[PDB]
Design a protein around this ligand. Structure first.
Ligand code: NAG
Lengths: 42, 49
């Protein structure tokens, strides 16, 4: 157990243009592919 | 159902593009018919014709 604690209110931050992953394992170049999936909103 | 439709995709882009072209074409048609002159000549007040 650890007790040397000092709680603070939950800090927040703006996440922008983050959380994009390759949706498949196919090589694809010069394409404006569109997908629908579990993605992190901008 | 939207996810199932999404694999088509280009069909509806095509359809919406066609209908947008039609709408623009109509506003065109009205312009070319009625907007022949870009000077709003107001009618004279006295009708001595
Ligand atoms: C302290 O440790 C015991 C067992 O390791 C655990 O059951 C208990 O929840 C702990 N209490 C705190 C305040 O960490």
């Amino acid at each position: 157990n650890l007790t040397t604690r000092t709680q603070l209110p939950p800090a927040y931050t703006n996440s922008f243009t983050r959380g994009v992953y390759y949706p498949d394992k196919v090589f694809r170049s010069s394409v404006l592919h569109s997908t629908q999936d579990l993605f992190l909103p901008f | 159902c939207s996810n199932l439709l999404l694999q088509y995709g280009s069909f509806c882009t095509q359809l919406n593009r066609a209908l947008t072209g039609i709408a623009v074409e109509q506003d065109k048609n009205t312009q070319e018919v009625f907007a022949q002159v870009k000077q709003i000549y107001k009618t004279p007040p006295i009708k001595d014709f």
